[PDB]
């Protein structure tokens, strides 16, 4: 179980991974470990977090530098924040992923900002 790809919209790939690994820091599940290991393997410094919410089978949320960030399934990440992504952004993101699990990444005030493909 390893990261196979990082999809983003306006963000740098590294920024999406850094945020996702910050949220996934202490999750024990092999997928979360892989996101963390990839940020580690690439020598990425993850931002600090105090506090997190984990919803088993859905995802994990934590505040990163003053904004909440959620990592998990598409619907649960999308539902976490009032800001929703344009329909064209969803097509673009899904078109890239369509070309193995996908973990989505979202941020309050922005909606979905990226996704991590796992193999």
Residue numbers in the entry: 558 to 656, 669 to 688
Publication text:
P-type ATPases are transmembrane proteins that play a key role in the uphill transport of a wide range of cations across membranes using the energy provided by the hydrolysis of ATP, being crucial for the ion homeostasis in nearly all organisms and for heavy metal detoxification. HMA1 and HMA6 are found in the inner membrane of the chloroplast envelope and HMA8 in the thylakoid membrane. Here, we present two structures of the nucleotide binding domain of HMA6 and HMA8, the former at the highest resolution, obtained for any P-type ATPase structure. The overall structure of HMA6N-AA and HMA8N (respectively) exhibits a twisted, antiparallel β-sheet made of six strands being flanked by two pairs of short α-helices, one on the concave (α1 and α2) and one on the convex (α3 and α4) side of the sheet.
HMA8 supplies plastocyanin in the thylakoid lumen with copper, which also controls the stability of HMA8, but not of HMA6. However, they exhibit differing catalytic properties, HMA8 having a higher affinity for Cu and lower dephosphorylation kinetics than HMA6. The N-domain of HMA8 (HMA8N) was readily expressed and purified, representing monomeric protein, which eluted as a symmetric peak with a calculated mass of 17.2 kDa. For both proteins, two molecules are present in the AU, yet they are monomeric in solution as found by size exclusion chromatography. The position of the second missing loop is identical in both structures, differing only in the length, as in HMA8 an insertion is present, not typically found in the subfamily. Furthermore, the insertion found in HMA8 could interact tighter with the P-domain and report on the N-domain inclination. In parallel, several attempts to obtain the structure of the HMA N-domains in complex with ATP were made by soaking or co-crystallization on HMA8N. They led to diffracting crystals but no density of the nucleotide could be observed. Of interest is also a second salt bridge in the vicinity of the nucleotide binding domain, E673-R697 in HMA6 and E612-R637 in HMA8, linking β2 to α3. Marked differences between ATP/ADP ratios in the cytosol and the chloroplast stroma, as well as between the pH of these two subcellular compartments (increase of the stromal alkalization on illumination), might also explain differences in electrostatic properties of this surface (HMA8 requires the efficient use of ATP at a low ATP/ADP ratio found in the stroma).
